[PDB]
Amino acid sequence: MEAAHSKSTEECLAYFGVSETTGLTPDQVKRHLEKYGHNELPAEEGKSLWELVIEQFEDLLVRILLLAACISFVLAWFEEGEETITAFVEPFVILLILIANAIVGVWQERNAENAIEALKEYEPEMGKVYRADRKSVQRIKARDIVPGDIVEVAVGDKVPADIRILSIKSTTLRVDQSILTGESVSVIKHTEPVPDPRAVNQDKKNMLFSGTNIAAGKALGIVATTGVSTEIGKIRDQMAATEQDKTPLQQKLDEFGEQLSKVISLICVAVWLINIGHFNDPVHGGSWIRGAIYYFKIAVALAVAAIPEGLPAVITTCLALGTRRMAKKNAIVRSLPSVETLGCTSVICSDKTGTLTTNQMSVCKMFIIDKVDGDFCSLNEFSITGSTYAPEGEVLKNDKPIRSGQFDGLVELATICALCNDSSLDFNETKGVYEKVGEATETALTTLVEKMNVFNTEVRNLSKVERANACNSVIRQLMKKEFTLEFSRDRKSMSVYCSPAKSSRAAVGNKMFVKGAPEGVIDRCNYVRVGTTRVPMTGPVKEKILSVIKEWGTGRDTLRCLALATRDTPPKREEMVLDDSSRFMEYETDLTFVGVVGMLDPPRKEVMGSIQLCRDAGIRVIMITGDNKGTAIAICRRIGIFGENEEVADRAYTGREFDDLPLAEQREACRRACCFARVEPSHKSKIVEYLQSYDEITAMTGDGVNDAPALKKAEIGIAMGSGTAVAKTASEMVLADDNFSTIVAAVEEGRAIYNNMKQFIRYLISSNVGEVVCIFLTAALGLPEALIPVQLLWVNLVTDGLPATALGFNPPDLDIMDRPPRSPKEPLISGWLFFRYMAIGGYVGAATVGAAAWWFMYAEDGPGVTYHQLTHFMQCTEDHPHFEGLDCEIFEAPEPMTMALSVLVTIEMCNALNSLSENQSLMRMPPWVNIWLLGSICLSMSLHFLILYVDPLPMIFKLKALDLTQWLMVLKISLPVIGLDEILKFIARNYLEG
Ligand SMILES: C/C=C(/C)C(=O)O[C@H]1C(C)=C2[C@H]([C@@H]1OC(=O)CCCCCCC)[C@@](C)(OC(C)=O)C[C@H](OC(=O)CCC)[C@@]1(O)[C@H]2OC(=O)[C@@]1(C)O
Ligand SMILES: Nc1ncnc2c1ncn2[C@@H]1O[C@H](COP(=O)(O)OP(=O)(O)CP(=O)(O)O)[C@@H](O)[C@H]1O
Ligand SMILES: [Mg+2]
Ligand code: NA
């Protein structure tokens, strides 16, 4: 391996000590191969079903359930009555539930995918090398390519490794480095070295990246780095090193079981102490192990009582629906759990051009030197109409139509835009629209010529599929494109070498047409053309030129400027090495300015407003672009990131400025800044680190593998619909429409979902609290079981779930977007709210137990010891004549249970409603505010009545109710809950919170 790109062709050949015409020798291979290993990325790791199901049974709760299911299973086998043939339901059900979860997670993860897996899609199976054990090129498996061997690639091949170019055989080499950046635009590779050792891939012009494709050409090169050491290999490392935390909800839940667990074992401790009398009174007689079974079978009740068995199903079904929802709004969210974290986004870093703007360019202004005399200088500003690349529009001066032709400067300005352009227009029939062909900024300048036919030629007499390129075509035939000197970020500009068409324009012949950033060119300008005539560049005219350029790109116009020039007497062709880049800037000098051109990348409509929502939302927004700081800011102002006259010194940095700062200040800059200019590689990733240090939930965008590491590290990495596959696999969400707006919209659904989600959680949990109270009392008093796990299950899963998932559709608040994002550290239940369900539950636990016990005493269908003796119901068949007098089995009666449970059910269909709002009376927030909530409650009730009226179902449970004598009892017990709440709710007025 080596830092080749900085080293010369010979330097690399020496390093690895290899022959360019021979290749590595079988010894060198074995050696190298050993030292560097094979050319591939470590394999994937995926827990087997075993490992899966094992974690599926790793949750403390699911564990607690498994133990519980066992105990029950053990207890069922301990009877010996033919009628106790139902005992195998309780355990069998729990297991189903448990199992069903495992069945999910296994099919869940199962259909997932790693972004690191996506990368291996870039690893081409074969490759071509030249090794000493043969003279012709060998076609071997990339896996076996080694650092140092001479490699060969061409037109269709996928570059197998990070290769330094040794020699280009075709007349030109082109590469599609999009898997890296995403830009489909091919680039030209050379052979000479690049000085900077810390140079970004972009400027490694003599380098070939493992993953990219050869757009056009054929070349020979020497392998620099392999496997994980290659540009793409580094990324894979970063993405694997990165660890993503759990959704705050998943956090909050794990925290719940952790506690749910401690309480449980504590109750057993209390319970045991309440029945500790058995150490000083027991007649050491029989029923000693008919008492153990009690504390045991009462345990598994306690468990299913404690766990919100159905919650998981509710949540997931909620998230899915919302997902499917967001999808309609163009937000493609991949992991359901994200929807939570999304609704909490603190900061959003959005790339500019693709999402904030439309990436649809068009020239608005022009300006050619009109007159220079003394210090008196006069320009010639214009305007151009038409936002589509469409050839439809008019050139104007002071908003008055004009014939570009009448001016010379323009005629040239035009020919330059027509010959220093590697793009083109095209018209499709499928959707009758004018489509860009080359690059955005060029495919525009071409549109600029069509709109301004400098030599008034027909056209209106031509079809659209001809009109698109019929003014350019003309200028293309007045001069000959000898070759071009490509754009390189060093000299920020480009130029085409031209010779005329013999006898028609051979006045001076060989010309050089250059376009590029205004700064660069204008310096390299020693003359200015005042329409068909030249004058030496001079102090004032230069200032006038630049000045307008600043206004155009800083002013409300926010335009991108391309100063245009031509080299009247270029050097002689033979005096030019068209294959080594350093000399281009030298070739593009002693120039004559012929005009600058401005163009606009229009923010999207929804942006202006979305940007405002976020403000309202207290969600910060940061733009990341490639625009010079000066312009970056201006555009930030035009959209609302900044105020028209707001101070921004400390709020917007440039990629470089940022490096020149210390890890300390670096951090500050981030929590306050809102605009990053020309940001290099790591910057994205680093910024996500500083925005996380302040514990902010942040979103990132981007689409090439270059940004996979940031997308993975952001709390919500965001990919583009038209982005690459890896980026997507590395992202939590995907804007099918690439639109910034789509982001916010989504952030909002997330805030809505959670609110409702949040409620049904509180709903289910609370009941689970009361269920336990019941089970406690039932054991603290000694009273016969009031409720059975089975019943309980059915409840928490169905009778209670439907209303839960129903509340999921709770209409959204109105100020959802006027409130700061939620703090992740916000507990679902605490304070006075803790107190309410502290109460409610305590109520159901009394209501329930009381009701069943009621049937025992005070009931007209099986009276009982109104003296409370029922408490020793254990002792019945024992001392029958010991106050018993009657049938020793009424305790095992079914009706008393059907009491305590129907009291529960109703108390829930009730408490369900008390949850439509956390603090609003129902007289304020009526139950019909959500029809599903009511619609479901009914579905659950009929269901309840289904377990009673069917014949199979009842047997597993309790018997029917005696409506009006027994049912009314239920109601005079339950309904009162609503009030208890309303009362406690009303306590929201007597305090200061609303
Ligand atoms: C589900 C049923 C029960 C009985 C339970 O043990 O819940 C406790 C518990 C673990 C918490 C408490 C429960 O505390 C009690 O109910 C007191 C025990 C008295 C009954 C014993 C009879 C002798 C929650 C349920 O209830 C109230 C209202 O007091 C609210 C909340 O839970 C949530 O926000 C849900 C988490 C998704 C948690 O305080 C939570 O602890 C936490 O870490 C939280 C933040 O989680
Ligand atoms: N095809 C081209 N040839 C020569 N100069 C060009 C050009 N396209 C743009 N320019 C000018 O050169 C300067 C830089 O070009 P560069 O290719 O880095 O821009 P870019 O802003 O399009 C990158 P990004 O796509 O990330 O926003 C620009 O600021 C512009 O003034
Ligand atoms: Mg460009
Ligand atoms: Na992520």
For the CA of 769, the closest atom of ligand 1 is 2
Pair 806, 933: CB distance under 8 Å: yes
Element (H, E) at 698: strand 698-701
Rg (C-alpha) for the chain, rounded Å, is: 39
Max CA-CA distance within the chain?
134
Q: Ligand 1, from 269, 765, 828: best to mutate by most atoms within 8 Å of Cβ?
A: 765
Residue 781 CA to ligand 1 center (angstroms) comes to: 23
Q: Is the CB of 678 under 6 A from ligand 2?
A: no
Task: Concatenate the DSSP letters of all residues of 812-841 into one string.
Answer: --SSTTTSPPPPTT--SS-HHHHHHHHHHH
Check if CATH label 1.20.1110.10 holds for domain 55-112+241-345+746-994. yes
The C-alpha atoms of residue 145 and residue 438 are separated, in whole angstroms, by 35
Instruction: Indicate which ligand has the atom closest to the C-alpha of 442.
Output: 2
Q: What are phi and psi of 43, to 5 degrees?
A: -65, 170
Q: Ligand 2: which residue has its CA nearest to atom 29? A: 517
Pair 919, 985: CB distance under 8 Å: yes
Burial of 581 (0-12, 13-18, 19+ CB in 10 A): buried
In DSSP terms, which residues pair with 187 in a beta bridge? 175
Architecture of the domain whose range is 346-358+603-745:
3-Layer(aba) Sandwich (3.40)
Beta carbons within 8 Å of 771's beta carbon, 6+ residues apart: 305, 306, 787, 792, 795, 796, 841, 844, 845, 904
Residue 363 CA to ligand 3 center (angstroms) comes to: 15
Q: Ligand 1, from 59, 263, 768, 838: best to mutate by most atoms within 8 Å of Cβ?
A: 263
Q: What are phi and psi of 761, to 5 degrees?
A: -70, -50
CA dihedral 754, 755, 759, 762 (to 10 degrees): 60
In DSSP terms, which residues pair with 499 in a beta bridge? 480
Q: Is 393 left (phi over 0), alpha (psi -120 to 50) or beta?
A: left
Q: Ligand 1: which residue has its CA nearest to atom 3? A: 769
Residue 832 CA to ligand 2 center (angstroms) comes to: 60
The C-alpha atoms of residue 988 and residue 924 are separated, in whole angstroms, by 13
Distances in Å between the Cα of 375 and the Cα atoms of 371, 538, 544 are 10, 9, 11
* Exposed e or buried b per residue across 705-717, where buried means at least 16 C-beta atoms within 10 angstroms of its C-beta: bbbbbbbbbbbbb
For the CA of 305, the closest atom of ligand 1 is 2
Pair 484, 497: CB distance under 8 Å: yes
Q: Is the CB of 442 under 6 A from ligand 2?
A: yes
For the CA of 422, the closest atom of ligand 2 is 1
Pair 147, 162: CB distance under 8 Å: no
Q: How many CB atoms lie within 10 A of CB 26?
A: 10
SS3 call for 888: coil
The C-alpha atoms of residue 778 and residue 780 are separated, in whole angstroms, by 6
Q: How many CB atoms lie within 10 A of CB 197?
A: 9
From first CA to last CA, the distance across the chain in angstroms is 65
The C-alpha atoms of residue 427 and residue 436 are separated, in whole angstroms, by 9
The C-alpha atoms of residue 382 and residue 628 are separated, in whole angstroms, by 24
Q: Is the CB of 632 under 6 A from ligand 2?
A: no
The C-alpha atoms of residue 642 and residue 675 are separated, in whole angstroms, by 9
- Three-state SS annotation for 635-647: HHHHHCCCCCCCC
Task: Concatenate the DSSP letters of all residues of 41-89 into one string.
Answer: --------HHHHHHHHT-SHHHHHHHHHHHHHHHHHHT---TT--STTS
The C-alpha atoms of residue 571 and residue 539 are separated, in whole angstroms, by 26
The C-alpha atoms of residue 306 and residue 299 are separated, in whole angstroms, by 10
The C-alpha atoms of residue 390 and residue 392 are separated, in whole angstroms, by 5
The C-alpha atoms of residue 322 and residue 4 are separated, in whole angstroms, by 50
The C-alpha atoms of residue 84 and residue 87 are separated, in whole angstroms, by 6
The C-alpha atoms of residue 306 and residue 773 are separated, in whole angstroms, by 10
> In terms of Cα–Cα distance, which of 312, 298, 138 is closest to 787?
298
In DSSP terms, which residues pair with 534 in a beta bridge? 529
Helices (H) and strands (E) in the chain, counts: 35, 33
CA 618 and chain centroid, separation: 20
> In terms of Cα–Cα distance, which of 1, 23, 422, 12 is closest to 192?
12
Instruction: Indicate which ligand has the atom closest to the C-alpha of 494.
Output: 2
The C-alpha atoms of residue 471 and residue 446 are separated, in whole angstroms, by 9
The C-alpha atoms of residue 704 and residue 177 are separated, in whole angstroms, by 10
For the CA of 352, the closest atom of ligand 2 is 27
For the CA of 439, the closest atom of ligand 2 is 1
Q: What are phi and psi of 315, to 5 degrees?
A: -45, -65
Q: What is the resolution of this structure in A?
A: 3.1
418's tokens: 């027509």
Instruction: Indicate which ligand has the atom closest to the C-alpha of 829.
Output: 1
Place of tokens 């999910």: 104
Q: Ligand 2, from 202, 487, 561: best to mutate by most atoms within 8 Å of Cβ?
A: 487
Q: Ligand 2: which residue has its CA nearest to atom 13? A: 517
Q: Ligand 1: which residue has its CA nearest to atom 16? A: 769
SS3 call for 410: helix
CA 843 and chain centroid, separation: 44
Instruction: Indicate which ligand has the atom closest to the C-alpha of 710.
Output: 4
Is residue 543 part of an annotated ligand binding site? Answer: no
Helix axes 60-77, 248-274, angle to 10 degrees: 40
Distances in Å between the Cα of 542 and the Cα atoms of 535, 553, 591 are 12, 17, 13
857's tokens: 């005493």
Q: What is the CATH number of domain 12-54+113-240?
A: 2.70.150.10
The C-alpha atoms of residue 699 and residue 864 are separated, in whole angstroms, by 66
The C-alpha atoms of residue 309 and residue 794 are separated, in whole angstroms, by 10
Strand order in the sheet with 213-216: 187-189, 173-176, 213-216
In DSSP terms, which residues pair with 625 in a beta bridge? 678
Place of tokens 């290999």: 233
> In terms of Cα–Cα distance, which of 556, 678, 684, 562 is closest to 629?
678
In DSSP terms, which residues pair with 550 in a beta bridge? none
**Could you give the residue range(s) of every CATH 1.20.1110.10 domain in the chain?**
55-112+241-345+746-994
Place of tokens 């959500």: 930
Q: Ligand 2: which residue has its CA nearest to atom 1? A: 442
- Three-state SS annotation for 935-960: HHHHHHHHHHHHHHHCCHHHHHCCCC
Is residue 466 part of an annotated ligand binding site? Answer: no
Is residue 309 part of an annotated ligand binding site? Answer: yes
Q: 132-137: which pairs have CB atoms within 8 A and are 24 or more residues apart?
A: 132/19, 132/22, 132/23, 132/24, 132/25, 132/26, 133/25, 133/26
Distances in Å between the Cα of 278 and the Cα atoms of 129, 270, 288, 291, 880 are 87, 14, 10, 11, 21
In DSSP terms, which residues pair with 563 in a beta bridge? 516
Distances in Å between the Cα of 159 and the Cα atoms of 30, 156, 574 are 22, 9, 34
Pair 778, 901: CB distance under 8 Å: no
Distances in Å between the Cα of 282 and the Cα atoms of 278, 287, 866, 875 are 6, 11, 25, 12
CA 675 and chain centroid, separation: 21
Instruction: Indicate which ligand has the atom closest to the C-alpha of 515.
Output: 2
> In terms of Cα–Cα distance, which of 972, 974, 962, 973 is closest to 862?
962
Spell out where 352-469 has E strands.
Answer: 363-367, 371-373, 376-378, 381-384, 395-397, 400-402, 425-427, 434-436
In this structure, what DSSP letter does residue 356 have?
I
Pair 459, 453: CB distance under 8 Å: yes
Pair 959, 966: CB distance under 8 Å: no
Burial of 657 (0-12, 13-18, 19+ CB in 10 A): middle
Residue 919 CA to ligand 1 center (angstroms) comes to: 20
CA dihedral 77, 78, 84, 90 (to 10 degrees): -60
Distances in Å between the Cα of 206 and the Cα atoms of 8, 188, 203 are 10, 9, 9
Residue 423 identity? S
Is residue 627 part of an annotated ligand binding site? Answer: yes
Pair 980, 840: CB distance under 8 Å: yes
Is residue 422 part of an annotated ligand binding site? Answer: no
Q: What is the length of the chain? A: 994
Q: Is the CB of 517 under 6 A from ligand 2?
A: yes
Q: What are phi and psi of 384, to 5 degrees?
A: -140, 130
Helix axes 895-913, 931-949, angle to 10 degrees: 170
Burial of 266 (0-12, 13-18, 19+ CB in 10 A): exposed
SS3 call for 285: coil
Pair 350, 622: CB distance under 8 Å: yes
For the CA of 829, the closest atom of ligand 1 is 34
SS3 call for 419: helix
* Exposed e or buried b per residue across 886-924, where buried means at least 16 C-beta atoms within 10 angstroms of its C-beta: eeeebbebebbbbbbbbbbbbbbbbbbbbbbbebebbee
Pair 205, 189: CB distance under 8 Å: yes
Q: How many CA atoms lie within 13 A of 386 on its CB side?
A: 22
Q: Is the CB of 515 under 6 A from ligand 2?
A: yes
> In terms of Cα–Cα distance, which of 594, 907, 878 is closest to 774?
907
Q: Is the CB of 353 under 6 A from ligand 2?
A: yes
Q: Is the CB of 352 under 6 A from ligand 2?
A: no
In DSSP terms, which residues pair with 207 in a beta bridge? 164
The C-alpha atoms of residue 796 and residue 768 are separated, in whole angstroms, by 8
The C-alpha atoms of residue 863 and residue 547 are separated, in whole angstroms, by 101
**Could you give the residue range(s) of every CATH 2.70.150.10 domain in the chain?**
12-54+113-240
The C-alpha atoms of residue 155 and residue 751 are separated, in whole angstroms, by 50
> In terms of Cα–Cα distance, which of 644, 609, 623 is closest to 817?
609
Distances in Å between the Cα of 88 and the Cα atoms of 70, 757, 844 are 11, 35, 28
Q: Is the CB of 202 under 6 A from ligand 2?
A: no
Is residue 550 part of an annotated ligand binding site? Answer: no
Beta carbons within 8 Å of 931's beta carbon, 6+ residues apart: none
Residue 40 CA to ligand 4 center (angstroms) comes to: 25
Residue 302 CA to ligand 1 center (angstroms) comes to: 14
Pair 535, 372: CB distance under 8 Å: yes
Is residue 751 part of an annotated ligand binding site? Answer: no
Pair 348, 699: CB distance under 8 Å: yes
208's tokens: 């070939």
CA dihedral 436, 440, 443, 448 (to 10 degrees): 120
> In terms of Cα–Cα distance, which of 736, 489, 496, 739 is closest to 609?
739
**Could you give the residue range(s) of every CATH 3.40.1110.10 domain in the chain?**
359-602
- Three-state SS annotation for 219-254: EEEEEEECHHHCHHHHHHHHHHHCCCCCCHHHHHHH
The C-alpha atoms of residue 169 and residue 217 are separated, in whole angstroms, by 8
> In terms of Cα–Cα distance, which of 450, 336, 331 is closest to 388?
450
The C-alpha atoms of residue 191 and residue 221 are separated, in whole angstroms, by 10
> In terms of Cα–Cα distance, which of 647, 648, 640 is closest to 614?
640
839's tokens: 């109460």
Q: Ligand 2: which residue has its CA nearest to atom 23? A: 626
- Which residues are known to be catalytic? 351
Residue 260 CA to ligand 1 center (angstroms) comes to: 7
Burial of 428 (0-12, 13-18, 19+ CB in 10 A): exposed
Pair 255, 60: CB distance under 8 Å: no
Task: Concatenate the DSSP letters of all residues of 702-752 into one string.
Answer: --SGGGHHHHHHSTEEEEETTS-HHHHHT-SEEETT--HHHHHHHHHHHHH
**Could you give the residue range(s) of every CATH 3.40.50.1000 domain in the chain?**
346-358+603-745
Residue 35 identity? K
Q: Ligand 2: which residue has its CA nearest to atom 8? A: 441
Pair 284, 789: CB distance under 8 Å: no
The C-alpha atoms of residue 396 and residue 363 are separated, in whole angstroms, by 12
Q: Is the CB of 516 under 6 A from ligand 2?
A: yes
Beta carbons within 8 Å of 952's beta carbon, 6+ residues apart: none
DSSP 3-state percent helix, strand, coil across the chain (nearest 5)? 45, 15, 40
Residues having CB closer than 6 A to ligand 1 are 252-253, 255-256, 259-260, 263, 267, 270, 306, 761, 765, 768-769, 772-773, 776, 827-829, 834, 837-838
Return the CATH fold of 359-602.
Calcium-transporting ATPase, cytoplasmic domain N (3.40.1110)
Is residue 657 part of an annotated ligand binding site? Answer: no
Is residue 800 part of an annotated ligand binding site? Answer: yes
For the CA of 772, the closest atom of ligand 1 is 4
Q: Is 964 left (phi over 0), alpha (psi -120 to 50) or beta?
A: left
In this structure, what DSSP letter does residue 279 have?
G
Beta carbons within 8 Å of 138's beta carbon, 6+ residues apart: 128, 129, 130, 131
SS3 call for 19: strand
Characterize the bridge pairing of strands 395-397 and 213-216: unpaired
Q: What are phi and psi of 392, to 5 degrees?
A: -110, 120
In this structure, what DSSP letter does residue 214 have?
E
Characterize the bridge pairing of strands 493-500 and 479-485: antiparallel
